[PDB]
Amino acid sequence: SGRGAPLAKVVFRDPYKYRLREEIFIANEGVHTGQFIYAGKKASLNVGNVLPLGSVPEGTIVSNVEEKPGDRGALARASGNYVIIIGHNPDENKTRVRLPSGAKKVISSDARGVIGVIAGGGRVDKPLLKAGRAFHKYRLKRNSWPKTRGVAMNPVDHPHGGGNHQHIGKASTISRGAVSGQKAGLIAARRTGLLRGSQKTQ
Amino acid sequence: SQVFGVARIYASFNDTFVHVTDLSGKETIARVTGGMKVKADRDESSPYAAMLAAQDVAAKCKEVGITAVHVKIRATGGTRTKTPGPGGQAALRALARSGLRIGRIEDVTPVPSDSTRKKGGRRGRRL
Amino acid sequence: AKRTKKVGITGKYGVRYGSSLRRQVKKLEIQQHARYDCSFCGKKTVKRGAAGIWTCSCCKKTVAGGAYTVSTAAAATVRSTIRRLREMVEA
Amino acid sequence: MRAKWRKKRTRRLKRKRRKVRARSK
Amino acid sequence: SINQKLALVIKSGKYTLGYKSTVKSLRQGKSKLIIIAANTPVLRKSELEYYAMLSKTKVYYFQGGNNELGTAVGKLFRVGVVSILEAGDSDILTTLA
Amino acid sequence: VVDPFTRKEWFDIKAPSTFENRNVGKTLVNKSTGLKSASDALKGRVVEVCLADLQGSEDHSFRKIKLRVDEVQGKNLLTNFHGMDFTTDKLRSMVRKWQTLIEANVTVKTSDDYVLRIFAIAFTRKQANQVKRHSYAQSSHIRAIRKVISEILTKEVQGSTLAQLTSKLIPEVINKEIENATKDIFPLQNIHVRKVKLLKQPKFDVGALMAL
Amino acid sequence: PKKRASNGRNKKGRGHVKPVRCVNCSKSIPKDKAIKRMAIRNIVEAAAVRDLSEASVYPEYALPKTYNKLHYCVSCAIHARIVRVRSREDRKNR
RNA sequence: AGGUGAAAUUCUUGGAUUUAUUGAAGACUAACUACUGCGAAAGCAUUUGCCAAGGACGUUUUCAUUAAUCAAGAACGAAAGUUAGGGGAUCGAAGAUGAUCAGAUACCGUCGUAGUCUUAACCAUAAACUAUGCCGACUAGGGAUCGGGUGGUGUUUUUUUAAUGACCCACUCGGCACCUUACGAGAAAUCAAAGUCUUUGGGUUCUGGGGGGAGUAUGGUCGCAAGGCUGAAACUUAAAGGAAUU
Ligand SMILES: [Mg+2]
Ligand SMILES: [Mg+2]
Ligand SMILES: [Mg+2]
Ligand SMILES: [Mg+2]
Ligand SMILES: [Mg+2]
Ligand SMILES: [Mg+2]
Ligand SMILES: [Mg+2]
Ligand SMILES: [Mg+2]
Ligand SMILES: [Mg+2]
Ligand SMILES: [Mg+2]
Ligand SMILES: [Mg+2]
Ligand SMILES: [Mg+2]
Ligand SMILES: [Mg+2]
Ligand SMILES: [Mg+2]
Ligand SMILES: [Mg+2]
Ligand SMILES: [Mg+2]
Ligand SMILES: [Mg+2]
Ligand SMILES: [Mg+2]
Ligand SMILES: [Mg+2]
Ligand SMILES: [Mg+2]
Ligand SMILES: [Mg+2]
Ligand SMILES: [Mg+2]
Ligand SMILES: [Mg+2]
Ligand SMILES: [Mg+2]
Ligand SMILES: [Mg+2]
Ligand SMILES: [Mg+2]
Ligand SMILES: [Mg+2]
Ligand SMILES: [Mg+2]
Ligand SMILES: [Mg+2]
Ligand SMILES: [Mg+2]
Ligand SMILES: [Mg+2]
Ligand SMILES: [Mg+2]
Ligand SMILES: [Mg+2]
Ligand SMILES: [Mg+2]
Ligand SMILES: [Mg+2]
Ligand SMILES: [Mg+2]
Ligand SMILES: [Mg+2]
Ligand SMILES: [Mg+2]
Ligand SMILES: [Mg+2]
Ligand SMILES: [Mg+2]
Ligand SMILES: [Zn+2]
Ligand SMILES: [Zn+2]
């Protein structure tokens, strides 16, 4: 609850003691109760498995990846999200991989990822339609709702305050080096206005 | 007892490329273009600029001392023009006439399996 | 007989929210509430619980999927893609 | 005007005449 | 293709459908072949082959689910596995491997 | 004034033990420091060259080849293979009007784990008594030929590990096995085999190469 | 008035074919309508070639060719003089 | 380096263009390709597998008038366009621009959103062309070709023969067409149908009635929209138009 992705309680035999360990994954789209999950360097190539990235060939899709292997998952965790293996530097074993945001990172090829995409994707397409349907979304996240715009407040409350009209008054873009108290608006905005396009940087 | 090279010549319009490699090419040596031995832009692919291009290139054959070369003429190709530019058969008969000894020519203009729609629009270049 | 000429399941929302959001909400209100087939059980009896969680009513076998469909376009191709790459690694 | 752009004309005129009516009742 | 070789047994020969019934035909050496829908579970699969191991018969694994097999045996319900008792006039028993 | 040619080396290469003229030529690298070496930088490369110069006569004007170097080997390198090709000129010299053209491809593993794919191509021909000016085939023949050309090529490999067959092609042979398999369906004037290349970057398993 | 039975050019039995692009200007023309001509340039130049087989290795041998099949849109195929206006009767040949 | 009549906008020593060795993505299917094929049309071209469908031929098979053409009512319907997902390599309405020009947000150059691919919905128009309704009958020669059948001491194929399969030769039915020539038709251009018509009737559906106003108005109706379908009048004019000649 609170998360748009579905979880997956998976259990393993503890190899140093007679008991079981229930590790909690984020379910990739396609895994199901009763499925067998393989977890290691020599694990094979099917969705749901979790492998070091030097193993999987150029072009795989993985998720909940580690920036430093052993951090137990930091990337591509949201519903419908994933990353792509794009290249291997084998000597100095690091793998370059492209992310949801379009960025490209180079992470130690020993990093563990989970084959496939995170389940529950497509959640954002349906409108919320009812203000209360958002009240309920955020009642299981945090007190981040609703936002009242600064231009409605008095100047004692917000740099966008005051005025006999409702105007920001001065440029709403703030330079990254502003001090906390000032950073209300479009911080370090390298542009503004209407785009048309998308990512893949260089 | 003679060694060879790889000419990878690229005879476009508006320019002419002569560029000799190792048979690998991961190490290659001293390109000259068609615009380095003349500066006009309306005279960049002219045969007179292809002779000048083979001149300062073969002259750099024995820069650490080698002799001979193989040839690969390639026009613009790809999606565009598929036919050798002007300074092609000029820049070759130059280094033939320039004592460097050659043989085994091939045409490696990249020709598609009819793909990737081409510049110019549907009514063409209307001049 | 026929109750709504166009509004179907979104008839609950009345006239509120604007004709086009109800039509977007509609499309996925159907997918979300549709009964699907079970890959293992064969029986057309899997429908969604929470988002991305799809349980066959009998046979009780749960699988993860899209938030509103049992299977997305993306997963179906990435499934047909690692299986593409898997086949050169194994052979 | 040739036909295709004379048609584009009386498509604009036919449609501005169509919308001026809506301002009234 | 090979779908088609079955509908001749139905008028010609005799058969039974289902786990609880074909698992008898195997306990009697009288099922001359069984056919298993692809979507049937492997636990039931593994155990149904053991009987063929004892009943002295080999089995053809079907390429469709219990649904596609039913339409193939010409019925309107899921079918996990079918057993041929007498092919009568049918080509199936030569047409294997 | 750097002149990165005097300050850089010049080596040699054998590729095979198959044919006669196993040695090539040379190139440079910034002379081999503690790493940045010709040992580390060098031999991630391979080559491209023709065939008649391999085996002498000029019935062989065609045929480029690839050559994958594996490991640094003592002021030399022995480079196995990363495939081969044809000539972008002589193909165009065949495909003429008023005749059908057939073309079949296949991919096969080698029993070790090294895998590859190879193509083939043929044309129709007029019988000696033809007056029909075009010699076309019936598209049933064409796929009945495509099906049985493919059956001919895979008959060889996978009873092959990475090297095992590599031996076999050179003398322009399988063109007769296609011929005895296809001079009952349609005449067929040109048969050849244009392009191969390797795909698997598998367990290198050093002990393989030294056979050559 | 109709000018040619083959109105544009050489299509009766199809209603549609896929178009090809002019090698000069990139105009789109349906393949059957286009005017195709083979360019099989010898790879050497006018004369310019005896100078090479001196610089040649190999008892001379060489002499391969180029092969581009040329498709011309009608506008360019007339500017380029590839094709000229025939008389009203001169207009039916192959 | 680019590009061009000629240039400029663009990139490049965090090294472009060129070369190599790997890889990824998305489109497209060259050359073979044609007075060749298939489909009701719009259209349809790499491979193989599965799903049904189809004409021609052959038939000493069966039914037996079940048929032809069609208000109403339906199915499909290029490209673009709409909505929402995916996808976005390329080219590229708009836009950005650099030239040119008297001006030139035009033709040229370089970028570039939508779009271009796709799924699920719409949309129903193209010079949707053969500007030629469909069914049927008859009225000229010719040689080609695609598919099918028959025929033949005919040429090539060896398995061990033959049988096929490829080619030649006659015929044949059915096509895509083509050449000749009109007796006939016609204003002519031209037509084997546009012939078999003042010697005017085989069956049938749809459309037109001088040129504009006008596919406008109004009503209706389909569409989310763009728009589609139906569709006047007041008024106005001695012409506007076709084919051929000089
Ligand atoms: Mg609050
Ligand atoms: Mg808000
Ligand atoms: Mg607010
Ligand atoms: Mg106040
Ligand atoms: Mg302030
Ligand atoms: Mg303040
Ligand atoms: Mg204010
Ligand atoms: Mg306000
Ligand atoms: Mg230039
Ligand atoms: Mg012009
Ligand atoms: Mg116009
Ligand atoms: Mg019982
Ligand atoms: Mg059981
Ligand atoms: Mg005219
Ligand atoms: Mg037809
Ligand atoms: Mg059309
Ligand atoms: Mg570089
Ligand atoms: Mg690799
Ligand atoms: Mg690789
Ligand atoms: Mg054909
Ligand atoms: Mg093709
Ligand atoms: Mg009607
Ligand atoms: Mg449409
Ligand atoms: Mg469309
Ligand atoms: Mg979209
Ligand atoms: Mg795009
Ligand atoms: Mg503009
Ligand atoms: Mg432009
Ligand atoms: Mg562009
Ligand atoms: Mg409709
Ligand atoms: Mg019409
Ligand atoms: Mg008739
Ligand atoms: Mg025939
Ligand atoms: Mg025949
Ligand atoms: Mg016969
Ligand atoms: Mg009138
Ligand atoms: Mg009138
Ligand atoms: Mg009026
Ligand atoms: Mg109206
Ligand atoms: Mg006139
Ligand atoms: Zn189930
Ligand atoms: Zn053109």
Side-chain angles (χ1 to χ4, degrees), chain A residues 1-201, chain B residues 1-21 25 28-47 49-50 53-54 58-59 64-127, chain C, chain D, chain E, chain F residues 1-132 134-212, chain G:
Chain A
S1 86
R3 171 205 314 264
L7 284 198
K9 322 213 223 202
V10 179
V11 77
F12 285 93
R13 45 203 321 266
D14 180 10
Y16 316 136
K17 195 172 176 182
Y18 181 88
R19 62 188 180 169
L20 256 54
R21 304 221 79 61
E22 172 186 89
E23 314 283 34
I24 288 183
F25 290 12
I26 307 149
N28 265 6
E29 199 180 308
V31 307
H32 56 62
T33 43
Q35 212 190 66
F36 282 135
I37 288 309
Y38 307 80
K41 175 189 310 252
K42 40 179 237 185
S44 85
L45 213 63
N46 324 100
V47 312
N49 291 335
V50 47
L51 282 54
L53 258 53
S55 325
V56 306
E58 304 122 328
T60 69
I61 286 96
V62 312
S63 46
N64 207 4
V65 170
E66 314 174 295
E67 312 150 291
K68 327 161 278 322
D71 64 46
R72 299 225 280 166
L75 310 202
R77 298 163 76 103
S79 92
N81 270 258
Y82 61 88
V83 311
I84 307 189
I85 278 67
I86 71 196
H88 295 269
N89 186 19
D91 37 3
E92 185 210 351
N93 68 327
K94 316 283 148 188
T95 283
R96 181 199 28 268
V97 48
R98 176 178 280 242
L99 322 177
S101 41
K104 330 180 306 161
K105 206 159 191 298
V106 79
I107 68 194
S108 154
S109 211
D110 300 331
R112 283 184 311 175
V114 170
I115 310 293
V117 311
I118 306 303
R123 157 185 33 108
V124 298
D125 277 351
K126 174 157 100 192
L128 284 199
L129 254 204
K130 275 152 69 183
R133 255 166 197 192
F135 165 97
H136 284 314
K137 181 166 180 170
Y138 288 97
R139 194 196 31 120
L140 310 156
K141 294 158 157 307
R142 74 206 62 85
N143 190 9
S144 100
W145 190 94
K147 314 241 181 213
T148 88
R149 310 145 325 165
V151 85
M153 302 141 79
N154 309 63
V156 52
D157 294 310
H158 194 314
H160 297 219
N164 288 340
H165 301 333
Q166 271 199 2
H167 58 312
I168 298 88
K170 312 183 140 288
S172 59
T173 76
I174 269 70
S175 182
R176 175 60 66 76
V179 66
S180 305
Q182 307 188 309
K183 249 164 191 162
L186 321 173
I187 320 104
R190 51 214 71 174
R191 73 173 316 289
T192 166
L194 199 73
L195 316 172
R196 57 281 168 217
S198 286
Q199 296 296 344
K200 195 272 156 308
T201 71
Chain B
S1 204
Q2 181 195 198
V3 301
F4 262 137
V6 195
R8 266 138 177 56
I9 166 178
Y10 171 17
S12 153
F13 297 65
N14 318 334
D15 214 334
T16 50
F17 264 52
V18 47
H19 167 219
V20 48
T21 83
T28 182
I29 61 86
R31 258 142 70 234
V32 65
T33 87
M36 262 185 306
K37 263 254 182 156
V38 72
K39 308 227 213 241
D41 291 6
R42 77 180 288 270
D43 285 317
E44 286 197 333
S45 60
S46 322
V64 168
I66 66 97
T67 166
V69 75
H70 273 195
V71 294
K72 301 291 196 199
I73 177 184
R74 57 153 288 156
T76 322
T79 170
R80 325 184 34 113
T81 301
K82 281 120 168 191
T83 64
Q89 299 156 49
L92 180 138
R93 66 171 319 209
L95 56 75
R97 215 191 140 140
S98 205
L100 210 172
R101 62 224 64 59
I102 53 56
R104 201 127 291 178
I105 77 89
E106 197 189 51
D107 182 350
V108 200
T109 65
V111 53
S113 324
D114 252 348
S115 307
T116 189
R117 195 192 192 222
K118 181 225 278 220
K119 154 84 200 139
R122 194 195 154 73
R123 281 123 50 71
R125 301 190 44 239
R126 298 140 277 153
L127 307 99
Chain C
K2 206 201 202 201
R3 270 92 60 80
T4 75
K5 311 275 158 333
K6 194 188 144 253
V7 191
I9 198 158
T10 45
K12 51 174 164 184
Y13 300 127
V15 307
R16 323 152 218 149
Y17 324 127
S19 51
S20 298
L21 307 186
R22 295 191 257 87
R23 275 320 157 268
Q24 299 178 11
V25 152
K26 165 129 108 182
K27 163 184 164 187
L28 320 174
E29 283 252 329
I30 282 84
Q31 309 173 358
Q32 162 184 329
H33 298 155
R35 249 173 170 255
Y36 294 89
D37 313 68
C38 187
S39 323
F40 327 104
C41 178
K43 299 177 167 60
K44 185 143 188 140
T45 177
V46 48
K47 29 168 298 285
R48 146 195 187 278
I53 293 179
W54 304 78
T55 39
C56 195
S57 178
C58 80
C59 156
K60 309 283 272 182
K61 228 146 188 288
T62 315
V63 50
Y68 304 134
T69 309
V70 62
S71 147
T72 74
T77 72
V78 317
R79 217 179 297 108
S80 179
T81 291
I82 66 90
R83 101 166 183 84
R84 138 170 140 81
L85 297 183
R86 190 211 326 180
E87 291 195 350
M88 63 166 246
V89 309
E90 314 180 309
Chain D
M1 70 169 207
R2 205 90 41 199
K4 192 200 314 315
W5 308 290
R6 173 60 139 181
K7 180 198 285 241
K8 197 169 182 319
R9 175 181 291 190
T10 85
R11 286 273 168 73
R12 187 166 23 160
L13 300 209
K14 198 224 291 216
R15 195 220 310 100
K16 48 76 160 187
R17 259 194 295 270
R18 161 214 294 177
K19 42 188 295 217
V20 304
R21 290 190 78 183
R23 179 116 161 271
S24 71
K25 37 86 190 168
Chain E
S1 310
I2 301 285
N3 68 296
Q4 36 82 23
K5 189 159 35 211
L6 295 69
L8 306 91
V9 64
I10 50 95
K11 229 215 177 186
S12 85
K14 311 294 191 168
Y15 40 82
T16 193
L17 302 310
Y19 174 53
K20 283 193 58 206
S21 74
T22 70
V23 75
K24 284 212 318 170
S25 52
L26 297 170
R27 312 190 303 210
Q28 323 202 320
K30 282 335 231 174
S31 182
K32 316 275 138 212
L33 177 45
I34 78 188
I35 297 95
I36 318 105
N39 75 317
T40 50
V42 197
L43 185 287
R44 169 153 301 170
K45 169 209 180 183
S46 39
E47 172 260 10
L48 256 184
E49 312 164 310
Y50 210 93
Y51 281 34
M53 156 190 287
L54 323 181
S55 147
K56 206 260 204 217
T57 178
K58 179 222 159 50
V59 310
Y60 185 22
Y61 314 118
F62 196 61
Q63 303 295 139
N66 39 18
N67 288 296
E68 299 104 274
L69 179 48
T71 50
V73 314
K75 267 323 282 191
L76 314 94
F77 30 92
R78 312 144 195 78
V79 48
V81 52
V82 56
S83 156
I84 306 150
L85 295 325
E86 172 214 348
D89 50 276
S90 163
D91 47 327
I92 68 100
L93 309 90
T94 83
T95 54
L96 290 136
Chain F
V1 279
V2 57
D3 191 86
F5 327 83
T6 41
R7 58 225 44 214
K8 265 159 293 269
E9 335 175 36
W10 214 6
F11 320 109
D12 70 286
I13 300 109
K14 252 178 185 184
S17 266
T18 165
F19 307 137
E20 310 76 53
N21 323 63
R22 306 160 60 176
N23 269 120
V24 278
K26 319 183 63 52
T27 170
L28 69 72
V29 59
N30 280 102
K31 51 214 53 175
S32 318
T33 71
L35 301 323
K36 298 164 286 137
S37 324
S39 191
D40 289 50
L42 164 60
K43 98 181 165 266
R45 66 204 28 191
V46 317
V47 198
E48 325 90 37
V49 85
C50 157
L51 175 84
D53 309 326
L54 278 188
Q55 321 303 113
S57 162
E58 291 323 276
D59 301 65
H60 271 189
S61 323
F62 332 115
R63 292 102 171 291
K64 318 191 56 57
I65 299 104
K66 294 258 178 158
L67 287 317
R68 168 198 195 181
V69 189
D70 321 64
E71 272 170 59
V72 57
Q73 314 112 317
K75 291 289 267 192
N76 198 329
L77 54 93
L78 251 173
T79 174
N80 207 346
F81 250 67
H82 219 276
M84 77 92 62
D85 198 20
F86 218 112
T87 85
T88 325
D89 157 71
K90 201 253 174 171
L91 298 123
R92 318 286 139 75
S93 76
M94 278 174 287
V95 293
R96 275 200 152 275
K97 270 212 210 76
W98 333 130
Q99 69 193 34
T100 304
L101 161 68
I102 318 167
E103 203 161 356
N105 87 94
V106 291
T107 89
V108 200
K109 192 197 176 181
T110 57
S111 206
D112 48 3
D113 263 24
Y114 289 64
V115 196
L116 60 86
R117 146 158 76 256
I118 165 63
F119 309 86
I121 178 183
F123 306 74
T124 56
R125 38 172 297 251
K126 327 192 190 193
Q127 209 66 40
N129 40 8
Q130 285 234 27
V131 305
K132 234 169 69 162
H134 50 232
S135 90
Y136 287 122
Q138 282 240 21
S139 87
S140 70
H141 310 350
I142 297 170
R143 61 185 93 95
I145 287 150
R146 220 192 323 265
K147 182 245 270 154
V148 309
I149 290 186
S150 148
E151 177 264 322
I152 278 291
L153 324 179
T154 38
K155 183 213 290 286
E156 269 58 21
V157 202
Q158 255 313 115
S160 272
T161 88
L162 163 65
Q164 189 235 71
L165 221 65
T166 51
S167 50
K168 190 194 181 227
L169 195 179
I170 306 85
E172 48 207 354
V173 67
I174 46 187
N175 307 45
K176 52 63 155 162
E177 307 258 319
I178 69 87
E179 261 216 318
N180 207 16
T182 73
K183 57 141 187 198
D184 52 289
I185 318 156
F186 210 90
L188 293 182
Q189 74 176 34
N190 263 83
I191 316 101
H192 314 278
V193 300
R194 333 163 296 102
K195 181 213 132 165
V196 202
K197 214 212 201 213
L198 324 191
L199 300 306
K200 239 293 203 178
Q201 311 206 163
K203 289 137 185 182
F204 286 59
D205 227 348
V206 304
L209 174 276
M210 299 75 210
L212 313 195
Chain G
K2 205 216 287 186
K3 239 186 160 193
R4 312 162 183 110
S6 86
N7 308 68
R9 172 64 200 299
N10 209 88
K11 187 267 307 166
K12 276 152 119 184
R14 259 146 287 268
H16 182 256
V17 306
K18 319 237 192 162
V20 301
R21 294 298 268 285
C22 191
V23 54
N24 186 324
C25 77
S26 300
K27 191 168 181 77
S28 189
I29 282 303
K31 193 160 104 92
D32 75 292
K33 169 104 150 203
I35 318 275
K36 312 105 166 194
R37 305 289 194 256
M38 263 317 306
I40 58 105
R41 274 134 212 193
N42 197 269
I43 194 44
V44 304
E45 187 196 44
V49 56
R50 193 148 285 270
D51 316 326
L52 176 154
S53 96
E54 193 225 4
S56 81
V57 193
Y58 308 112
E60 317 114 306
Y61 95 99
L63 212 50
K65 277 139 305 164
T66 55
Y67 318 79
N68 189 11
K69 184 163 148 235
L70 274 44
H71 324 86
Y72 294 97
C73 87
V74 187
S75 298
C76 298
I78 300 189
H79 199 190
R81 218 78 48 76
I82 298 180
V83 86
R84 280 146 213 155
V85 306
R86 269 124 69 105
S87 97
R88 216 200 308 172
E89 280 210 45
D90 285 357
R91 264 169 178 159
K92 317 134 183 187
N93 301 87
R94 272 146 196 87

PDB file of all heavy atoms in Angstrom, chain E residues 38-49:
ATOM      1  N   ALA E  38      -1.301 -28.898 -23.583  1.00  0.00           N
ATOM      2  CA  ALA E  38      -0.056 -28.259 -23.165  1.00  0.00           C
ATOM      3  C   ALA E  38      -0.214 -27.527 -21.838  1.00  0.00           C
ATOM      4  O   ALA E  38       0.695 -27.543 -21.000  1.00  0.00           O
ATOM      5  CB  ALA E  38       0.429 -27.299 -24.250  1.00  0.00           C
ATOM      6  N   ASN E  39      -1.362 -26.883 -21.624  1.00  0.00           N
ATOM      7  CA  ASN E  39      -1.549 -26.042 -20.449  1.00  0.00           C
ATOM      8  C   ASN E  39      -1.768 -26.831 -19.164  1.00  0.00           C
ATOM      9  O   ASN E  39      -1.807 -26.225 -18.088  1.00  0.00           O
ATOM     10  CB  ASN E  39      -2.723 -25.087 -20.675  1.00  0.00           C
ATOM     11  CG  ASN E  39      -4.067 -25.778 -20.572  1.00  0.00           C
ATOM     12  OD1 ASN E  39      -4.255 -26.883 -21.083  1.00  0.00           O
ATOM     13  ND2 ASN E  39      -5.013 -25.127 -19.907  1.00  0.00           N
ATOM     14  N   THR E  40      -1.910 -28.152 -19.242  1.00  0.00           N
ATOM     15  CA  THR E  40      -2.108 -28.952 -18.043  1.00  0.00           C
ATOM     16  C   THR E  40      -0.860 -28.906 -17.163  1.00  0.00           C
ATOM     17  O   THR E  40       0.263 -28.839 -17.671  1.00  0.00           O
ATOM     18  CB  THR E  40      -2.431 -30.394 -18.414  1.00  0.00           C
ATOM     19  OG1 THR E  40      -1.460 -30.870 -19.354  1.00  0.00           O
ATOM     20  CG2 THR E  40      -3.808 -30.475 -19.036  1.00  0.00           C
ATOM     21  N   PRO E  41      -1.028 -28.947 -15.839  1.00  0.00           N
ATOM     22  CA  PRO E  41       0.121 -28.765 -14.945  1.00  0.00           C
ATOM     23  C   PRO E  41       1.155 -29.867 -15.117  1.00  0.00           C
ATOM     24  O   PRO E  41       0.872 -30.953 -15.626  1.00  0.00           O
ATOM     25  CB  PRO E  41      -0.508 -28.804 -13.547  1.00  0.00           C
ATOM     26  CG  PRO E  41      -1.751 -29.606 -13.724  1.00  0.00           C
ATOM     27  CD  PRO E  41      -2.262 -29.246 -15.092  1.00  0.00           C
ATOM     28  N   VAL E  42       2.379 -29.567 -14.681  1.00  0.00           N
ATOM     29  CA  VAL E  42       3.463 -30.528 -14.846  1.00  0.00           C
ATOM     30  C   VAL E  42       3.402 -31.623 -13.786  1.00  0.00           C
ATOM     31  O   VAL E  42       3.785 -32.768 -14.058  1.00  0.00           O
ATOM     32  CB  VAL E  42       4.825 -29.815 -14.840  1.00  0.00           C
ATOM     33  CG1 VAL E  42       5.899 -30.729 -15.411  1.00  0.00           C
ATOM     34  CG2 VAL E  42       4.746 -28.521 -15.636  1.00  0.00           C
ATOM     35  N   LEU E  43       2.934 -31.305 -12.573  1.00  0.00           N
ATOM     36  CA  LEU E  43       2.719 -32.344 -11.568  1.00  0.00           C
ATOM     37  C   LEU E  43       1.820 -33.438 -12.122  1.00  0.00           C
ATOM     38  O   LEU E  43       2.161 -34.626 -12.077  1.00  0.00           O
ATOM     39  CB  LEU E  43       2.119 -31.738 -10.294  1.00  0.00           C
ATOM     40  CG  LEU E  43       1.910 -32.600  -9.034  1.00  0.00           C
ATOM     41  CD1 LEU E  43       0.760 -33.610  -9.128  1.00  0.00           C
ATOM     42  CD2 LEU E  43       3.210 -33.310  -8.667  1.00  0.00           C
ATOM     43  N   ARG E  44       0.657 -33.050 -12.645  1.00  0.00           N
ATOM     44  CA  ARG E  44      -0.222 -34.018 -13.285  1.00  0.00           C
ATOM     45  C   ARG E  44       0.432 -34.606 -14.529  1.00  0.00           C
ATOM     46  O   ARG E  44       0.254 -35.791 -14.831  1.00  0.00           O
ATOM     47  CB  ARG E  44      -1.558 -33.361 -13.629  1.00  0.00           C
ATOM     48  CG  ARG E  44      -2.450 -34.201 -14.522  1.00  0.00           C
ATOM     49  CD  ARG E  44      -3.916 -33.879 -14.301  1.00  0.00           C
ATOM     50  NE  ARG E  44      -4.322 -34.106 -12.918  1.00  0.00           N
ATOM     51  CZ  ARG E  44      -5.491 -33.727 -12.415  1.00  0.00           C
ATOM     52  NH1 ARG E  44      -6.371 -33.101 -13.186  1.00  0.00           N
ATOM     53  NH2 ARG E  44      -5.782 -33.970 -11.145  1.00  0.00           N
ATOM     54  N   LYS E  45       1.200 -33.793 -15.258  1.00  0.00           N
ATOM     55  CA  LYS E  45       1.932 -34.300 -16.414  1.00  0.00           C
ATOM     56  C   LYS E  45       2.909 -35.392 -15.997  1.00  0.00           C
ATOM     57  O   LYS E  45       2.851 -36.520 -16.493  1.00  0.00           O
ATOM     58  CB  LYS E  45       2.672 -33.160 -17.117  1.00  0.00           C
ATOM     59  CG  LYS E  45       3.673 -33.632 -18.165  1.00  0.00           C
ATOM     60  CD  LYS E  45       4.834 -32.661 -18.339  1.00  0.00           C
ATOM     61  CE  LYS E  45       5.815 -33.164 -19.391  1.00  0.00           C
ATOM     62  NZ  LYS E  45       7.002 -32.279 -19.545  1.00  0.00           N
ATOM     63  N   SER E  46       3.809 -35.066 -15.065  1.00  0.00           N
ATOM     64  CA  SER E  46       4.823 -36.017 -14.616  1.00  0.00           C
ATOM     65  C   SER E  46       4.198 -37.330 -14.169  1.00  0.00           C
ATOM     66  O   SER E  46       4.706 -38.415 -14.486  1.00  0.00           O
ATOM     67  CB  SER E  46       5.631 -35.404 -13.476  1.00  0.00           C
ATOM     68  OG  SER E  46       4.787 -34.652 -12.617  1.00  0.00           O
ATOM     69  N   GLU E  47       3.083 -37.254 -13.440  1.00  0.00           N
ATOM     70  CA  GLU E  47       2.457 -38.444 -12.879  1.00  0.00           C
ATOM     71  C   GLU E  47       1.703 -39.248 -13.931  1.00  0.00           C
ATOM     72  O   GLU E  47       1.645 -40.481 -13.840  1.00  0.00           O
ATOM     73  CB  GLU E  47       1.533 -38.028 -11.735  1.00  0.00           C
ATOM     74  CG  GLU E  47       0.665 -39.122 -11.170  1.00  0.00           C
ATOM     75  CD  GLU E  47      -0.739 -39.051 -11.714  1.00  0.00           C
ATOM     76  OE1 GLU E  47      -0.964 -38.275 -12.667  1.00  0.00           O
ATOM     77  OE2 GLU E  47      -1.618 -39.760 -11.185  1.00  0.00           O
ATOM     78  N   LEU E  48       1.130 -38.576 -14.932  1.00  0.00           N
ATOM     79  CA  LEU E  48       0.438 -39.286 -16.002  1.00  0.00           C
ATOM     80  C   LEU E  48       1.414 -40.029 -16.907  1.00  0.00           C
ATOM     81  O   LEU E  48       1.054 -41.062 -17.485  1.00  0.00           O
ATOM     82  CB  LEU E  48      -0.401 -38.306 -16.821  1.00  0.00           C
ATOM     83  CG  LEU E  48      -1.912 -38.301 -16.582  1.00  0.00           C
ATOM     84  CD1 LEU E  48      -2.596 -37.333 -17.537  1.00  0.00           C
ATOM     85  CD2 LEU E  48      -2.499 -39.698 -16.720  1.00  0.00           C
ATOM     86  N   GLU E  49       2.643 -39.525 -17.050  1.00  0.00           N
ATOM     87  CA  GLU E  49       3.634 -40.231 -17.854  1.00  0.00           C
ATOM     88  C   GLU E  49       4.155 -41.466 -17.138  1.00  0.00           C
ATOM     89  O   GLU E  49       4.524 -42.449 -17.791  1.00  0.00           O
ATOM     90  CB  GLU E  49       4.808 -39.318 -18.200  1.00  0.00           C
ATOM     91  CG  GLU E  49       4.436 -37.958 -18.736  1.00  0.00           C
ATOM     92  CD  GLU E  49       5.603 -36.996 -18.684  1.00  0.00           C
ATOM     93  OE1 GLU E  49       6.231 -36.881 -17.609  1.00  0.00           O
ATOM     94  OE2 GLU E  49       5.901 -36.364 -19.718  1.00  0.00           O
TER      95      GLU E  49
END
